[PDB]
Amino acid sequence: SMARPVSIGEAVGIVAAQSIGEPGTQLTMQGLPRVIEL
Amino acid sequence: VVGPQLKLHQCGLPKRMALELFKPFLLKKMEEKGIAPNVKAARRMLERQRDIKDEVWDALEEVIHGKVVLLNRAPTLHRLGIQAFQPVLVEGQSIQLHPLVCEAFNADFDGDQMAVHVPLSSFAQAEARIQMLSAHNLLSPASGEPLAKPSRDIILGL
Amino acid sequence: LLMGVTKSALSTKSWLSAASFQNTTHVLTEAAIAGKKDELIGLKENVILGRLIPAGTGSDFVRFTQVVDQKTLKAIEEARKEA
Amino acid sequence: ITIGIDDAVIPEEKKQYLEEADRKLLQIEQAYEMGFLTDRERYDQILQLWTETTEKVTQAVFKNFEENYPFNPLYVMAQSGARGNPQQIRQLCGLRGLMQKPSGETFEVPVRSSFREGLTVLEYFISSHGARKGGADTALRTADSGYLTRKLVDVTHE
Amino acid sequence: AEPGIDKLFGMVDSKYRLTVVVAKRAQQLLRHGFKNTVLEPEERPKMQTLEGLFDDPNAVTWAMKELLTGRLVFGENLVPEDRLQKEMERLYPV
Amino acid sequence: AXXXXXG
Amino acid sequence: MEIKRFGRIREVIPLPPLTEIQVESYRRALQADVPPEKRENVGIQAAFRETFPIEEGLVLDFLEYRLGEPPFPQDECREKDLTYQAPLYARLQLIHKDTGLIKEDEVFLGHIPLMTEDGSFIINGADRVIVSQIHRSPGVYFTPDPARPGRYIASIIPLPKRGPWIDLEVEPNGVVSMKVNKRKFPLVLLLRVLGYDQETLARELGAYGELVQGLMDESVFAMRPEEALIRLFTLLRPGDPPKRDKAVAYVYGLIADPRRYDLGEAGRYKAEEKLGIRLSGRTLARFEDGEFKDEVFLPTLRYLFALTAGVPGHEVDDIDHLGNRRIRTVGELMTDQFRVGLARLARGVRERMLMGSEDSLTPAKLVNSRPLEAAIREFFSRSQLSQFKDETNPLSSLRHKRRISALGPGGLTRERAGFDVRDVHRTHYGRICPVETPEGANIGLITSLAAYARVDELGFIRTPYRRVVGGVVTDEVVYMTATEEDRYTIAQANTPLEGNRIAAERVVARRKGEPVIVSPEEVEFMDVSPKQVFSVNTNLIPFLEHDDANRALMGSNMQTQAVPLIRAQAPVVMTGLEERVVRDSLAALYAEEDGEVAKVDGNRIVVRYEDGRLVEYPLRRFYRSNQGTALDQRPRVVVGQRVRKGDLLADGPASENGFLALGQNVLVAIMPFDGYNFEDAIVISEELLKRDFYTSIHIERYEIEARDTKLGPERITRDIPHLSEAALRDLDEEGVVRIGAEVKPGDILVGRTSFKGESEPTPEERLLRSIFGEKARDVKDTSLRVPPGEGGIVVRTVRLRRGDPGVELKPGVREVVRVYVAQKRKLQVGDKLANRHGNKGVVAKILPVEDMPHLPDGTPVDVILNPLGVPSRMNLGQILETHLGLAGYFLGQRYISPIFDGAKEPEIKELLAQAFEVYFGKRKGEGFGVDKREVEVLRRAEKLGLVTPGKTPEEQLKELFLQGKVVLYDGRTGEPIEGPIVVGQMFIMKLYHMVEDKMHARSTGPYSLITQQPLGGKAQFGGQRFGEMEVWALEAYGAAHTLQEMLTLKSDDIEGRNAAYEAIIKGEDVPEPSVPESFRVLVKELQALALDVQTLDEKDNPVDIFEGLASK
Amino acid sequence: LDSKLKAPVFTVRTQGREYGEFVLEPLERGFGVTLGNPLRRILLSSIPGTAVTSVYIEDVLHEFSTIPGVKEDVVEIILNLKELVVRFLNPSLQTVTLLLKAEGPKEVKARDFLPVADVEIMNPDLHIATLEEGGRLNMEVRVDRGVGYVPAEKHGIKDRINAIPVDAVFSPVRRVAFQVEDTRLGQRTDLDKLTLRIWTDGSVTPLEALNQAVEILREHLTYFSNP
Amino acid sequence: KEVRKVRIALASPEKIRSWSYGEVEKPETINYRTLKPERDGLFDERIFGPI
DNA sequence: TATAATGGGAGCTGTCACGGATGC
DNA sequence: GCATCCGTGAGTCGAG
Ligand SMILES: CO[C@H]1/C=C/O[C@@]2(C)Oc3c(C)c(O)c4c(O)c(cc(O)c4c3[C@H]2O)NC(=O)/C(C)=C\C=C\[C@H](C)[C@H](O)[C@@H](C)[C@@H](O)[C@@H](C)[C@H](OC(C)=O)[C@@H]1C
Ligand SMILES: [Mg+2]
């Protein structure tokens, strides 16, 4: 987001989950079922 | 509803909404001036709508100055589902949103609704202003690419 | 051992998180038998208790930071120079 | 910038590409008549033919726009990235294209009408299968997506 | 965007540290009635009212500007808490 | 009734 | 104005009565107008016939029934919160076998709700529509086995809750297994129970691939039907003693009992047609001459093995086929519940026959109506198929009545619903609409009956087709089931005709849904009309062929949400269906026969007919609908006017001169405007609010009860403690607000005073009481006040009191007061507008008239739409509607362009040419040449290849106008928009999602009981929900204190929230928050689960969060 | 219905003679752009100024020819001549012909123009041309009073057969940009705030420029007087 | 003190009896007339507390 | 407070997508 | 070792 070193204390996990999850509704039903499969 | 005029960091906030949201602060700033003897008087004064007067609006304007609120549109898919905006009192019951943040909320003008939250303490307000301010996050925490960028009419005109 | 996200979630150390996730009876019984303690390492736990999460402004790293002006700093400096 | 019905420009090339296609169809038909091609073979060949034809008339629309009408609104909005993609624009000025049966199998007879010329009832009803399937997809996938997001959050949250 | 936000993000090793600094400073200013400000009268943030310009009531704005002026010292374990409290109370009554 | 708000 | 119609398609038959599904279903069920001896066996008659006679010995028997007259009329029922219903009386006779004593009596069975004229119901005062249900038709099906490719599954399905499904499958081991109540057992056994012997099955099933040998078992034929029966009873009933008569009774109840196991008449016919046999009863077998006889199982097994072998003339079944799916209408559902209630009544009757005086008993003393009443009432009040009426506009009700739901009892459950169920089947053609459905979870599960579609007596949907003999199209129409439709070759409705003869060599037709090009010699039937393919909503979208199916869906749905406007107009471009919709919804008032109009009043219309009789028609005026929209009729005629049969008298809600009015026709320009229409937002002219376009009346009901308490009575009074005359100004003597007073939030609608709860005064209160020397009053002010954001003018007050004539309330309640408040809503920023083509948006800006883009003659436009909304969505219908709308603007005429047969481009161009003449030639005659700005714009358009270079300015302006574009001046500048813009009249509706309803905010307010968290909902003045995902958001931002505020200070930390509020109003920063109460509740709940939750320190030494209050 | 209106306060912010900002608030609804657009048109188009219409250079046949001994081509010198800001001190003077003669290793600035009666050169340090050893520059430039912008092909004026017509930029105003922001007086939030920005060449100041602009407009309002 | 940990374990019958402020010997909730808690009932003020 | 009376009914049906436990 | 059974999951705010 800031195009620079990550600040210590930034919560990475939630950011990762959100980043993976948001586009998810743009995938169909190899699409979403393949992702869930993985 | 889209404000075109808003700076990236701003949002149109209906007067009545802001009055109710900020109400304790407004009572306090009403006792700070000569508008009311005390808190309870000010509250009883605001209770009825026909008891509302000119000075109280300028008072509210003083109250909210420098402060920000939080706009959130369901579903919140990623971090930017909530963003911090400096409120600007507007006529009408509608919240005005800045165009560039639309893509981030996946919001459009076909009747989407948004929620307003008011951070209370100095800490919460500081977090909102520095960390969550719309103008402060310009890029996708996901792809790294620009998040708030020209779209629709803007790209068209340019 | 490679396990999928759900099992890995349920398999975590914090029983508050696991109990909030899924299979509440199972998690809670296995936690109660072994008399588990939750150290509140993660976010969900402290969220449930309503504490300040261990991230951002609530990270031990940046949260103990102090701020003082030069005037007061020098006054306290003189207070330290006296003793 | 506006949109009139004449702003969707049906290229002449279309007609040519259609007639030629028909001719080829007949050829393939003859190939089925004497037993050179099986049922599934003929089906596949027809599908391929119509796919390539659709592609061709898309390229025809866009070439016509680029050379003859560079400022045509559909073309502008498409190229700038403000609105629309080649397939949609093709449906507007070109042919609508191949359609799917409820089973997922494709009909041998494509809609030859643009939205400009307008569809015929049988064409419309044929397309409604696809529309319904797509809409149901969109409505159903939100839940599973959400579920996935939640699982991910719960596994990564610490 | 908050004025000179880039400089502020430059000052600190982590953005959240900047946040904590500003919040704490703002609480100090609120508690001591702004008397402890490191800003000269001409540097005071101004809210423009119906009558004319006045002092900006917002503590966070002040704290960010003070921070920008480099007139503040931020860090861990500078002074014992009760000592700082008592001293700030001494110089600036409340 | 759902999607982007037909009903 | 002249209405010009287009299209060459001649409709042979008009649209059937649209509510006929509802009205005819229910009428068929009741037979209230049929004399008892003439009643067919159907509906409640059939229910009585099933239940009776009752035995065990006394015998209670059925003769006939009768339905009386409603104790109260419909309107009165609506006002008194009653149910519109008729009494049900039943003639019965008790018979003692031995004594021969016969006692005949008419017993009162309670009440049955009556369907109103429009095909709705009134239940407990509320208008409710019973929605017809789609399900799997009873019968016998054969479907491919998912696991074993070569094999198949046979299924025998009866009516819902009419008994169990049965599965015949050929097992891997070779034996044929039957599944009932989730029990697999060899079919051979049952075949032996039916009385079959090895010889019979050998000669019947022998012709096959030796699957029959799997049905061959020596141990089975080694035991007689009795022994086999007891064997089967031991198999299906573990632990239950295998008595002979109990086994016969159970197996008979499972198979041959009509009172328990019932196929439909549909299941009957279908089984007959499928298996190629003839059924006597509706069961699978019989009990005759002491033994069991087989109607079904052997033909079924035969067909099964015949499908397995590959024998020609045997095929699987499509369960999505509309020949295999049927509709249970209102009558069938109501009858089902009636049958259940009757069964309960019979159980009670037998139970009452066993004990009690055996000499003196009457049908009155045996029969208790309670279970039947509770059954019917349960159905009408609590059934998922009984729905609160959609009253928004008349089209809403009409569409609601035509709804087909796959949900409800015996129906599907979503989240269990797959794609195959939601798909559009090929057999949906002409029957169920391919377009109109929801976008969300319910998509494909809820659908709409097609315009020409009908439901037969068997419950299958049928569509009309014209007979075609030897290329000659007759006027003979035949309604077909999907199964019957599959048998023919059906030509399309747009195919050319000269007279009654087909004029094309190659005609487009359908065979089993598959499109095929045939010769007129081959055409058996032909489509009645394109109209039949879609629903009523979909049929209201002009230029539909130019719209993508999805946006068509959106517009179709959105019309239902159109709010009735005071000025509402019919669309400039209609489909020709605008009138029938109003006529059938019974919104508008019409003339019964030819005659002269005697009187015209705002409240009434008096008419003298040819019969010489004076018929007076009262008008419903400003009634509140279920959705709060104002439904009122206005008279369209005048004194003395001659009127034929069917002429319009009063104009219903959302109706203009008999035409359906869902909105306004406004003059639109499609151009981007300063980012105000950005992303589907809409900009409107203030001239729309000035002339009251898009203005609607809305009525809201407020209700308050004064009851008796153990602390003393509540009472409605004008005497309210601690209130001024200023606050009591608009209150009358009794304490009720006066009619016509303007009420704003905070005002008192109805005064009320309740005796205070027993109150120990806090010391501060006592001291202050001593200081001011005032008695603390015994009663406090509970008065009903206008909620926040509400308010309007008070148009009605209803007061009911216990001890008043005809008035009795629920026990304990002294009096009920109702206040009706009507408000007149103009259009405002945040309100939702939409067209019929699926373009929807919120008004984002209301510009003053001078800012609005205008024509050269000074005419401003009402609405500025964004062009960007068109291409991605692919709905071009709005464009054409706009062009033809421009023509109609300058020619002063409206049009009718039916779907798929309508105004095409050239004709629109001609009309636009004439329009150009009116728009320009006048100007030339007025002595004004071409403007400089028009020159600049013409240079621009010339560069755009829009106009042919070298022509005169007039010629090029005509060239543009023909393309539907005009020169436009920006009102702020006066300079022209560089290009020509598309301008024209468009029909836009105001949807019922209005910002005035949706806006809410709260600082502090009520909290929940157990959770101690803020209540939900605007009505409760509650807070917004901050959920798991919002929490994740805050976490990702790493704002810790904000999150902690949400979790603690803002909600459910008691001490924390109180302290925070006190601090803020004091001017102090908010305190450190403490433990949220809901965690304490969690801890205590876990303790109640016998689990110990200890909050420790790092020393593993307990920390008490309850602060000692929980520890002895 | 009953209306009250306070006379707006005119706010001026000026940096030198080259620039200024002009704020008029509060204004009645719509009146932001009502005053704004006309003044813009009037400022750019009609404000009196001076420009170089024609230029003659010895041994130079046409505009795209090159000058031996000088690095810039004729075109680049014409451009530099377009940026020359010349002020007429005498209101009587409608036109001037400025002569310049130079050679050798020297860079000619606007100072080198031989002074003329009541003619002030605002930008004497402006670069015209650089000459090397053996290079010669003999030129005469025609400066006329006028208004707005006239292309060379439009006036087509020549004193000499080899004289080249130059696009004449008369306007002392380089740019006008105006914006209307919503501001509030007491209860009403829509009241217009007009912010005006004007660029000049220094010959006429922005404040002077705007005052001239409102005068032109006001005089035109008197044209509705006598039929 | 500050809460740094949360422990969960099976509660002993003795611990359960330790938590309890009394035994509920009656199914009763509140009285049909006085609308106040009964004695030894689920809502009894003797055990759980003053209203 | 006493003729004698001695084994209950309703199920409820178009989801997979499975996870680990249990069974020839 | 591989079919089979039982329990537990199946998006968010809004109004209701
Ligand atoms: C009593 O039924 C309730 C739920 C039962 O549960 C469930 C499980 O079974 C059904 C059945 C049998 C249906 O057919 C539903 C249905 O068709 C829906 C939405 C549902 O969720 C339905 C539900 C269920 O959710 N979509 C529509 O109807 C759309 C296409 C048009 C009409 C919209 C208006 C706004 C409504 O008509 C409204 C006036 C009101 O009538 C209903 C909201 C009703 O609420 C009440 C107070 O009556 C619901 C249906
Ligand atoms: Mg939307």
Side-chain angles (χ1 to χ4, degrees), chain C residues 67-72, chain E residues 24-39 44 62 66 71-72 84 87-89 91-93:
Chain C
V67 180
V68 63
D69 46 317
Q70 273 290 348
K71 280 189 173 182
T72 304
Chain E
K24 289 190 170 184
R25 179 56 186 169
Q27 287 185 349
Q28 291 183 353
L29 288 183
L30 281 181
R31 172 169 45 254
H32 298 308
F34 283 99
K35 302 179 180 301
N36 43 342
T37 180
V38 313
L39 304 180
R44 282 173 173 250
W62 283 66
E66 287 187 351
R71 304 174 193 171
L72 286 172
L84 179 59
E87 290 284 347
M88 290 216 74
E89 288 176 34
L91 291 179
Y92 328 94

Side-chain angles (χ1 to χ4, degrees), chain B residues 108 110 112, chain F residues 4:
Chain B
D108 49 35
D110 59 28
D112 298 15

Side-chain angles (χ1 to χ4, degrees), chain G residues 1112, chain I residues 17 19-24 46-48:
Chain G
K1112 291 183 292 190
Chain I
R17 297 186 188 103
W19 293 340
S20 177
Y21 270 56
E23 185 190 11
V24 180
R46 304 282 188 90
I47 312 177
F48 311 95

Side-chain angles (χ1 to χ4, degrees), chain G residues 384-388 399-400 403 405 407 414 442 446:
Chain G
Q384 294 180 335
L385 293 163
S386 180
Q387 295 175 9
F388 199 57
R399 166 190 152 172
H400 196 178
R403 187 170 320 295
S405 174
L407 308 187
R414 53 206 193 190
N442 283 321
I446 276 71

Side-chain angles (χ1 to χ4, degrees), chain B residues 51-108:
Chain B
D51 294 337
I52 304 179
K53 51 193 60 185
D54 203 325
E55 311 86 42
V56 329
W57 301 105
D58 302 308
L60 177 63
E61 281 242 11
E62 293 180 21
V63 159
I64 79 170
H65 183 264
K67 282 173 169 286
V68 296
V69 293
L70 298 183
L71 295 184
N72 166 237
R73 171 185 185 271
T76 302
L77 302 192
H78 55 192
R79 184 169 80 188
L80 296 93
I82 308 186
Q83 286 174 36
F85 291 84
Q86 229 155 75
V88 165
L89 300 187
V90 288
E91 288 298 329
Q93 306 178 254
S94 292
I95 291 169
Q96 297 171 5
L97 189 63
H98 186 284
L100 291 178
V101 304
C102 277
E103 182 185 342
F105 290 102
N106 190 23
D108 49 35

